[PDB]
Write a protein that binds this ligand. Structure first.
Ligand SMILES: CCCCCCCCCCCCCCCCCC(=O)OC[C@H](COP(=O)([O-])OCC(O)COP(=O)([O-])OC[C@@H](COC(=O)CCCCCCCCCCCCCCCCC)OC(=O)CCCCCCCCCCCCCCCCC)OC(=O)CCCCCCCCCCCCCCCCC
Ligand SMILES: CCCCCCCCCCCCCCCCCC(=O)OC[C@H](COP(=O)([O-])OCC(O)COP(=O)([O-])OC[C@@H](COC(=O)CCCCCCCCCCCCCCCCC)OC(=O)CCCCCCCCCCCCCCCCC)OC(=O)CCCCCCCCCCCCCCCCC
Ligand SMILES: CCCCCCCCCCCCCCCCCC(=O)OC[C@H](COP(=O)(O)OCCN)OC(=O)CCCCCCCCCCCCCCCCC
Ligand SMILES: CCCCCCCCCCCCCCCCCC(=O)OC[C@H](COP(=O)(O)OCCN)OC(=O)CCCCCCCCCCCCCCCCC
Ligand SMILES: CCCCCCCCCCCCCCCCCC(=O)OC[C@H](COP(=O)(O)OCCN)OC(=O)CCCCCCCCCCCCCCCCC
Ligand SMILES: CCCCCCCCCCCCO[C@@H]1O[C@H](CO)[C@@H](O[C@H]2O[C@H](CO)[C@@H](O)[C@H](O)[C@H]2O)[C@H](O)[C@H]1O
Ligand SMILES: CCCCCCCCCCCCO[C@@H]1O[C@H](CO)[C@@H](O[C@H]2O[C@H](CO)[C@@H](O)[C@H](O)[C@H]2O)[C@H](O)[C@H]1O
Ligand SMILES: CCCCCCCCCCCCO[C@@H]1O[C@H](CO)[C@@H](O[C@H]2O[C@H](CO)[C@@H](O)[C@H](O)[C@H]2O)[C@H](O)[C@H]1O
Ligand SMILES: CCCCCCCCCCCCO[C@@H]1O[C@H](CO)[C@@H](O[C@H]2O[C@H](CO)[C@@H](O)[C@H](O)[C@H]2O)[C@H](O)[C@H]1O
Ligand SMILES: CCCCCCCCCCCCO[C@@H]1O[C@H](CO)[C@@H](O[C@H]2O[C@H](CO)[C@@H](O)[C@H](O)[C@H]2O)[C@H](O)[C@H]1O
Ligand SMILES: CCCCCCCCCCCCO[C@@H]1O[C@H](CO)[C@@H](O[C@H]2O[C@H](CO)[C@@H](O)[C@H](O)[C@H]2O)[C@H](O)[C@H]1O
Ligand SMILES: CCCCCCCCCCCCO[C@@H]1O[C@H](CO)[C@@H](O[C@H]2O[C@H](CO)[C@@H](O)[C@H](O)[C@H]2O)[C@H](O)[C@H]1O
Ligand SMILES: CCCCCCCCCCCCO[C@@H]1O[C@H](CO)[C@@H](O[C@H]2O[C@H](CO)[C@@H](O)[C@H](O)[C@H]2O)[C@H](O)[C@H]1O
Lengths: 115, 171, 345, 96, 142, 98, 172, 105, 83
């Protein structure tokens, strides 16, 4: 109950500041004020057009590496096992293959951003 | 489709060991040494019988043993014991390591007054054997008789009679 | 691909079905099917053109969707019975979605529409893996739960596959599309008999595979993708004309070739179970397959289509293919009906 | 230093877990009686509430077997207040 | 479900009697086949607009329902007039009438003629199956 | 438990319906697959907890591991589609009709 | 508090409805983040802890990659929201109404079957080992390192092979 | 399995966590361990077809233990009959069902 | 092996991070195999009693099982107390 209570208060405080910030100040809306900023000149296109991602391969590698750490985060419970040798070999093998995967991608220039 | 048999409320009346967790933990090591035989009898009943209704008599002996143990503390070592469990009760986890000074004073008292030796590390976790007049339950799961296996066919192998017998093939 | 990539990817292609066939747990069976999907995609798209990208994408979205439905059934059964295998007590709807999703993985009609398109978009040697090695894991699952399956859904899938495999193959001029429709028709036969006799499902799978493998090798020899390309065989590799003709007639189930055996035995077993109407319909529409195979035989070995002047330069060159696996499979896929009793029991 | 301190913390944990072992017989006996008394109380109210209901057998098991089946939380606290039921469902997990 | 029972009611009474109920049952069955076929048609061969898709769904369903009505009516009237409940020929006449209807709706004498023979033979064989206890989807036995 | 599992199965069915009813973006469909994965994860996890089946808790984690591999391949394919056509629209992926 | 888990599973259902309508993947990505959070709460509510926090953490990472991919490869001049198209909005409202209807009707016909609005909160936790110590979900997951090592072998292989797979798919 | 490699080699990659009654960490029995143990043991050695009829008692009990359809319905009936009587003013819950119990121990 | 020594020396000067990573990885594998304390880690996990030690019924043929927790029979923990 307590965790729910404090997070609601955190939400409540943030939303109150937003309401104050939008209803206290004097406003003056006109078109030139609300147009998008681009260093004093008009944009030549939408900001909604495609924006190329040069690190796209690192990005999807990160998806796999993020499930690798998910497999590592039970380790504090796993070190309590009687089967210490089995746990240790499994953890060593898991870390080593992930290193080999990173090493391969590194030597394939998979960490280099595209030009 | 049978009626579940429940003991009456009168059968479940006992003298409660109504002291707090710090009191129990402060005395837990001497309690385990002093009331072991009664406590191990009740736990053997529970694991053998798998039914709390079959162990009510032994459960009541557990409560009586615990009350006789605490009345010995009350008559001889009340003040060393109170100083100990009150200090132990301060900690959010009721840790032993924050009250070693008061534990030693209590331990010395129950040793001189009652001869009680505190068990060593590892001793209370041992599996022990206990003697009981209670019979061993024969079918604790109330399981039915298993269905009989299929009859097995015996004898030596012979060739298939007239070969494969697949349509017009001769062999 | 460099050697390390080939070894890892081909090993995973091999591994997935082995996991599926050896697993007791349904989750490990699903894991095996997951390995197959993931590992085969880079091979499908290896050549990297818009058609191969289309083929790999269509294959991925179909297979991943079917994999989720299979997982739903496994999870629902785990909820119902607290176990990781289907039982006699498994809810029938759970089993019917397993059948639906596995049949979509296999490309059985009416979940077939993807398979002729994906086969058309990939290299011949990948079509070979798609239509042979990749069938084994989903079929292996089905064979394990054959007493639990609904005969009504199976026969409807089976007759639909035979009908659409037949009519589908009738309109094709592309070889890769003809093989895909041949796959669908033969899967219809494999499935029809699975709930009655799963051993005859395996007999049909084996005979289909040893017919399809050398047929793909024959296409691979000159990279013949169309009827008009294969019709130049008489000028490029005439020695293959005898075995292609017999393999095509064997695929069509004409006696006294080995490919008559699966249709013959499945009919026998279907009628031992009074499945007379389906067996009649299946056998009658399987003749339509023999029609488009015959038209293919007409354009390769029984007539000689016009050739071209550049083909003379080909006759000056020596070839190093086919390997001797072609001859072994070609002979055993056509000339082994005399050994029929050793193949069914 | 971490080796020595963790070896000491392992000896302390054993002592703490051995105190639990000594007290567990008492807690088991108390819990058996508490569960049975709660089940008894439910049975008596069922005898009044389901008195004029046709074909109702008070106390009937839903199982064929006659071995003891521990009650569910819903069974034990089904007839009590919403707070006792909420405390059983969420007491530990919402205590922070 | 009760929907299944509504279709078992076709065989509850001998042919040639209760021709009104049997015509509703076969009209309903024909409509369902038209709805299934229409669903696959619009999904796989989409129309140029939604009103054409809905127009095509109605064209298929009513045409399929008309075929089922003519089959069910003609079969029962034929058995009533000829006083032959258990004759597969009554079903051949009905299946031919259904086949003629399909040709009339699609403006084709070849579909009428080809429809009559194929649908007559299929319907006649259905009656023979009902009489002789054929199973369409037998469960495994051996 | 009864009502929670009904709602979770409905959540899977909606995600599958989303998968089966394409709009234009291939990426929107890839998100629907992740929705089915998410529903199945919770269903497996809640079942293991409700039955106190601690030996089955590895299985929900393995569901996420292979889903991550499936999602990574899906995104890798989507890069290829976008490179060919400049969008991820599925209507362009129609060369194999002939 | 007796409605707590039903409310959460009801919120989860709406999130998947929003995802199924497939607005711009920007809002699809947001829909999965909220559903992931709601899904974490449900796992927690049933006594979970590690599993709920894992799936939220994994999906937080997963949707960040999808955000990056969306801005490069799945964007249009006018990204669609749930309100932008009247047709999508109507099926959002109709879908929510059909949820209330489906739960209402199923409650009437069975009353204790799939929906048991009278008994909500009475059948969440079934049994709990009251005096236990080693019971948290992380212990169960950790069996991959000792008792279920085959589960970890296959999981590790798929991530390892995935690196080689995505490198092959993405090279020109 | 389709290929019984695990049985031939005498290993266990996934045979040992197949059902509720299997080994659990720290010997924490799963729900319905005893019912599933009885059902598996009744069925052993006689095959699935016979097990469906002849172990029907064990399966029903295990099914009830795990899914609890009958337990939920029985409590729904008692609580529904109590609601009817209280509205009619014929039943008054005791103090211990109203939150004023004498707590044990 | 003078060619490698120049190689390793250059790697140390120019890629020290990778040299440390491989050395640490190799040490982590080696150390459990040569350490005299490796055997105790499993023994300590085995001596932690998370579960109640259920007693056994005495049949008169258990010379090795203690009858009381302070009997001199059963597993001793003196090794850990003096570890
Ligand atoms: C915060 C409160 C909202 C304040 C917004 C505001 O400043 O006023 C704008 C608005 C006033 O009108 P307006 O400024 O002219 O509208 C122009 C906006 O740009 C137009 O607004 P927009 O471009 O931001 O698009 C609105 C759109 C986008 O808004 C969102 O959906 C994001 C929040 C969803 C949570 O919202 C909807 O489509 C309806 C949302 C319905 C709830 C979603 C249910 C399905 C998803 C389930 C998963 C839950 C996530 O109110
Ligand atoms: C109850 C449902 C509860 C809500 C559950 C929703 C489930 C998730 C929704 C996923 C739908 C989706 O993504 O599809 C996108 C799919 C493709 O969208 P798109 O590529 O962006 O453009 C085509 C749209 O028509 C948008 O382009 P448009 O504006 O040119 O569409 C023209 C036309 C579209 O006509 C429609 O309104 C289609 C819906 C017909 C009513 C269906 C009633 C529900 C049954 O709109 C109209 O003028 C008719 C309005 C009056 C309709 C009442 O859109 C649709 O076709 C309609 C989507 C909404 C239908 C959801 C109902 C699902 C039930 C299964 C239906 C199939 C059953 C077939 C076997 C029987
Ligand atoms: C194993 O997968 O066999 C499957 C199937 C037999 O079916 P089944 O009994 O269910 O499998 C369990 C044990 N085999 O096995 C089969 O279906 C048999 C597959 C046969 C494929 C025939 C191809 C022609 C090869 C002919 C040469 C083989 C030797 C011929 C006989 C030699 C004796 C002279
Ligand atoms: C029950 C009644 C089933 C009727 C079978 C579907 C026939 C529908 C149809 O007419 O074909 C649909 C589609 C194209 O048809 P269309 O182009 O619209 O019509 C000709 C235009 N000149 O033609 C096609 O592309 C083939 C239709 C898809 C396959 C239909 C699958 C039938 C159902 C099998 C279920 C098996 C369950 C297991
Ligand atoms: C195998 C057995 C083969 C050997 C048996 C042969 C016996 C046949 C004897 C009777 C045949 C009499 C046919 C007379 C000639 C008619 C003709 O040639 O035209 C056929 C006509 C062609 O169709 P069309 O005019 O082009 O219109 C477009 C249709 N899509 O119409 C058509 O082609 C389409 C007609 C479709 C309706 C027929 C029923 C099909 C569905 C089967 C139902 C079974 C259940
Ligand atoms: C291709 C990937 C390669 C990377 C993976 C390499 C994994 C190989 C790991 C080798 C190291 C194993 O190290 C091994 O550790 C275990 C405990 O963990 C030690 O085991 C020792 O202590 C344990 C307690 O833990 C005792 O029960 C055991 O009797 C004793 O041998 C072994 O003496 C040591 O050999
Ligand atoms: C295909 C099945 C049979 C083969 C079985 C698989 C084992 C193959 C063993 C030979 C593999 C060696 O293959 C070798 O891989 C390395 C990966 O580090 C590649 O090399 C890579 O790293 C080295 C670093 O100096 C550089 O060449 C470059 O950065 C990159 O290409 C080589 O270009 C390739 O020749
Ligand atoms: C149950 C009975 C079994 C019947 C067995 C069937 C036998 C095979 C029938 C298919 C015949 C193969 O097809 C036949 O192939 C041979 C080469 O081998 C061709 O042979 C001819 O043309 C080729 C070039 O095309 C020349 O190189 C060759 O010297 C010439 O004889 C025939 O023109 C062709 O018709
Ligand atoms: C236009 C000609 C079409 C030729 C095709 C064949 C036509 C014959 C089929 C229609 C005959 C009457 O319709 C047929 O009878 C009734 C309808 O109430 C149902 O009859 C059957 O129902 C079920 C099948 O689900 C059986 O278990 C039941 O024993 C039997 O009565 C069938 O579902 C339907 O097929
Ligand atoms: C017991 C016997 C009962 C006989 C009645 C049942 C048989 C039904 C036969 C239906 C015949 C098809 O129906 C016939 O289709 C032709 C196709 O040229 C169409 O005929 C009409 O339109 C077509 C083009 O659309 C023109 O080319 C033609 O000159 C004109 O007559 C009509 O739609 C109808 O005259
Ligand atoms: C051109 C298309 C037609 C192709 C013709 C196919 C071959 C000829 C078909 C003959 C029809 C078979 O006729 C049918 O046979 C079956 C199978 O024995 C038997 O029929 C019966 O079989 C068994 C008893 O043996 C029953 O359980 C079953 O329910 C019932 O159908 C009858 O004998 C007859 O109802
Ligand atoms: C996106 C958000 C969706 C919100 C969904 C709706 C949330 C509200 C849930 C309403 C469902 C029923 O919610 C509530 O259930 C409890 C059980 O816990 C019932 O419980 C109470 O009333 C019923 C009889 O009326 C009996 O069980 C008993 O007297 C008492 O426990 C409440 O009467 C009912 O109002
Ligand atoms: C072709 C690719 C595959 C080859 C690569 C994989 C090699 C296999 C490595 C994984 C080995 C798993 O090895 C397997 O471990 C489990 C525990 O996890 C052991 O399991 C053992 O302990 C468990 C603990 O609960 C008992 O319940 C079980 O009855 C017992 O067999 C198996 O006896 C052993 O066979």
């Amino acid at each position: 109950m307590n965790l729910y209570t404090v997070i609601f208060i955190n939400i409540l405080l943030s939303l109150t500041l937003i309401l104050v910030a939008f209803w206290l100040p004097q406003m003056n809306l006109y078109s030139e004020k609300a147009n998008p900023y681009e260093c004093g000149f008009d944009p030549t296109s939408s900001a909604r057009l495609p924006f190329s991602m040069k690190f796209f391969l690192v990005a999807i590698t990160f998806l796999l590496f993020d499930l690798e750490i998910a497999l590592l985060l039970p380790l504090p419970w796993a070190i309590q096992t009687i089967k210490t040798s089995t746990m240790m070999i499994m953890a060593f093998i898991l870390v080593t293959i992930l290193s080999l995967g990173l090493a391969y991608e590194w030597t394939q220039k998979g960490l280099e951003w595209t030009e | 489709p049978g009626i579940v048999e429940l003991p009456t409320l009168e059968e479940l009346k006992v003298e409660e060991v109504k002291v707090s967790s710090a009191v129990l933990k402060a005395a837990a090591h001497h309690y385990g040494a002093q009331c072991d035989k009664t406590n191990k009898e009740f736990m053997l009943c529970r694991w053998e019988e798998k039914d709390p209704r079959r162990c009510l008599k032994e459960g009541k002996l557990v409560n009586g043993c615990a009350l006789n143990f605490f009345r010995q503390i009350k008559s001889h070592c009340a003040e060393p014991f109170t100083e100990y469990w009150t200090c132990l009760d301060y900690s959010n986890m009721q840790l032993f390591r924050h009250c070693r000074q008061q534990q030693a004073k209590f331990d010395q008292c129950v040793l001189d007054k009652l001869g009680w030796v505190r068990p060593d590390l590892g001793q209370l976790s041992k599996v022990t054997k206990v003697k009981t007049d209670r019979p061993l339950p024969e079918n604790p799961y109330h399981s039915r008789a298993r269905p009989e296996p299929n009859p097995v066919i015996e004898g030596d192998l012979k060739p298939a009679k007239h070969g494969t017998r697949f349509f017009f093939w001769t062999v | 691909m460099n050697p390390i990539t080939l070894a890892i990817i081909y090993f995973t292609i091999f591994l997935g079905p082995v996991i599926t066939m050896s697993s007791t747990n349904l989750m490990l069976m699903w894991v095996g099917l997951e390995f197959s999907l993931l590992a085969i995609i880079p091979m499908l798209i290896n050549k990297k053109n818009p058609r191969s990208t289309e083929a790999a994408t269509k294959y991925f979205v179909t297979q991943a969707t079917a994999s989720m439905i299979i997982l739903l059934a496994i999870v629902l059964n785990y909820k119902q019975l607290g176990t990781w295998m289907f039982q006699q007590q498994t809810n029938g709807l759970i089993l019917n979605m397993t059948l639906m999703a596995l049949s979509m993985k296999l490309g059985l009609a009416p979940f077939h529409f993807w398979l002729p398109e994906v086969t058309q978009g990939i290299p011949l040697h990948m079509g070979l893996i798609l239509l042979t090695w990749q069938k084994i894991a989903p079929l292996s699952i089905l064979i394990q739960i054959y007493p639990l399956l609904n005969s009504t859904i199976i026969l409807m899938l089976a007759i639909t596959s035979i009908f659409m495999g037949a009519w589908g193959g009738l309109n094709q001029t592309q070889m890769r599309k003809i093989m895909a429709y041949s796959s669908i028709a033969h899967m219809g036969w494999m499935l029809a008999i699975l709930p009655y006799n799963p051993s005859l499902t395996l007999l049909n799978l084996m005979i289909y595979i040893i017919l399809t493998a050398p047929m793909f090798m024959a296409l691979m020899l000159n990279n013949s993708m169309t009827i008009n390309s294969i019709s130049l065989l008489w000028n490029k590799t005439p020695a293959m004309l005898t075995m292609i003709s017999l393999m095509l007639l064997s695929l069509g189930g004409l006696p006294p070739l080995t490919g008559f055996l699966p249709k013959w035995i499945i009919i026998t077993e279907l009628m031992k179970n009074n499945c007379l109407i389906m067996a009649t319909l299946m056998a009658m529409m399987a003749l339509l397959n023999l029609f488009f195979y015959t038209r293919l035989i007409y354009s390769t070995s029984l007539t000689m289509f016009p050739t071209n002047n550049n083909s003379k330069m080909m006759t000056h060159q020596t070839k190093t293919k086919p390997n001797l696996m072609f001859s072994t499979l070609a002979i055993m896929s056509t000339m082994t009906l005399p050994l029929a009793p050793q193949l069914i029991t | 230093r971490m080796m020595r301190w963790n070896q000491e913390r392992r000896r302390l944990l054993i002592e703490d877990l051995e105190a639990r072992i000594a007290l567990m017989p008492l807690f088991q006996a108390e819990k058996d009686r508490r569960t049975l008394q709660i089940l008894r109380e439910n049975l008596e109210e069922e005898a009044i509430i389901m008195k004029d209901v046709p074909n109702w057998k008070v106390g009937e098991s839903v199982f064929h077997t006659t071995r003891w089946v521990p009650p569910l939380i819903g069974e034990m606290y089904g007839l009590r207040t919403k707070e006792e039921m909420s405390n059983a469902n969420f007491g530990f997990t919402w205590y922070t | 479900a009760m929907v299944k029972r509504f279709f078992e009611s076709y065989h509850e009474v001998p042919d040639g009697t209760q021709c009104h109920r049997k015509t509703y049952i076969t009209t309903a069955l024909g409509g369902i086949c038209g709805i299934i076929g229409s669903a696959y048609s619009v999904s796989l061969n989409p129309a140029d607009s939604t009103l054409e898709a809905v127009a095509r769904v109605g064209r298929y369903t009513f045409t399929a329902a008309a075929i089922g009505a003519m089959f069910g009516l003609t079969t029962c009237v034929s058995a009533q007039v000829r006083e032959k409940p258990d004759d597969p020929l009554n079903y051949f006449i009905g299946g031919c009438a259904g086949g003629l209807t399909l040709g009339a709706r699609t403006h084709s004498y070849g579909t009428a003629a080809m429809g009559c023979v194929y649908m007559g033979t299929a319907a006649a064989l259905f009656k023979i199956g009902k009489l002789e206890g054929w199973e369409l989807f037998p469960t495994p036995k051996v | 438990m009864p009502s929670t599992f009904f709602n979770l199965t409905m959540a899977f069915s909606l995600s599958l319906l989303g998968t089966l009813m394409f709009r234009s973006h291939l990426m929107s469909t890839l998100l629907c697959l992740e929705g089915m994965v998410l529903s199945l994860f919770i269903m497996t996890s809640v079942t293991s907890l409700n039955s106190n089946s601690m030996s089955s808790m590895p299985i929900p984690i393995t569901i996420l591991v292979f889903a991550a591999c499936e999602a990574a391949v899906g995104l890798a394919l989507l890069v290829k589609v976008s490179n060919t056509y400049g969008t991820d629209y599925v209507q362009n992926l129609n060369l194999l009709q002939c | 508090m007796n409605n707590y888990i039903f409310v959460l599973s009801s919120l989860f259902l709406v999130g998947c409805l929003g995802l199924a309508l497939k607005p711009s993947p920007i809002y699809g990505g947001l829909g999965l983040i909220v559903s992931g959070f709601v899904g974490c709460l449900m796992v927690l509510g049933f006594g979970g802890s590690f599993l709920g926090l894992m799936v939220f953490l994994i999906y937080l990472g997963g949707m960040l990659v999808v955000f990056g991919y969306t801005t490069a490869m799945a964007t249009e001049e006018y990204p669609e929201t749930w309100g932008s198209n009247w047709l999508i909005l109507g099926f959002l409202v109709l879908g929510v109404i059909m949820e209330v209807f489906l739960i209402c009707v199923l409650n009437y016909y069975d009353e204790v079957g799939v929906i048991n609005l009278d008994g909500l909160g009475d059948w969440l936790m079934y049994e709990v080992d009251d005096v236990g110590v080693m019971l948290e979900g992380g212990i169960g997951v950790a069996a991959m390192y000792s008792c279920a090592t085959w589960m970890m072998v296959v999981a590790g292989w798929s991530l390892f092979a995935g690196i080689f797979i995505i490198i092959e798919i993405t090279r020109d | 399995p389709f290929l019984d490699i695990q049985k031939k080699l005498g290993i266990s990659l996934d045979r040992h966590f197949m059902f509720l009654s299997a080994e659990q960490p720290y010997k924490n029995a799963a729900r319905c361990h005893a019912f599933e143990k009885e059902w598996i043991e009744c069925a052993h050695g006689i095959g699935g077809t016979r097990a469906k009829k002849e172990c029907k008692i064990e399966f029903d009990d295990f099914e009830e233990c795990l899914l609890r359809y009958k337990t939920m319905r029985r409590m729904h009936d008692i609580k529904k009959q109590r609601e009817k009587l209280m509205k009619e003013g014929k039943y008054t819950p005791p103090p211990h069902h109203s939150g004023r119990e004498e707590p044990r121990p | 092996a003078g060619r490698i020594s120049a190689f390793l020396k250059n790697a140390w000067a120019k890629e020290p991070v990778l040299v440390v990573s491989f050395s640490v990885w190799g040490l982590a594998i080696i150390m459990p195999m040569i350490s005299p304390y490796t055997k105790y880690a499993s023994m300590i996990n085995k001596a932690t009693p998370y579960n109640y030690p259920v007693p056994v019924r005495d049949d008169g043929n258990m010379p090795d099982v203690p009858s009381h927790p302070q009997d001199p029979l059963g597993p001793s923990l003196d090794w850990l107390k003096n570890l």
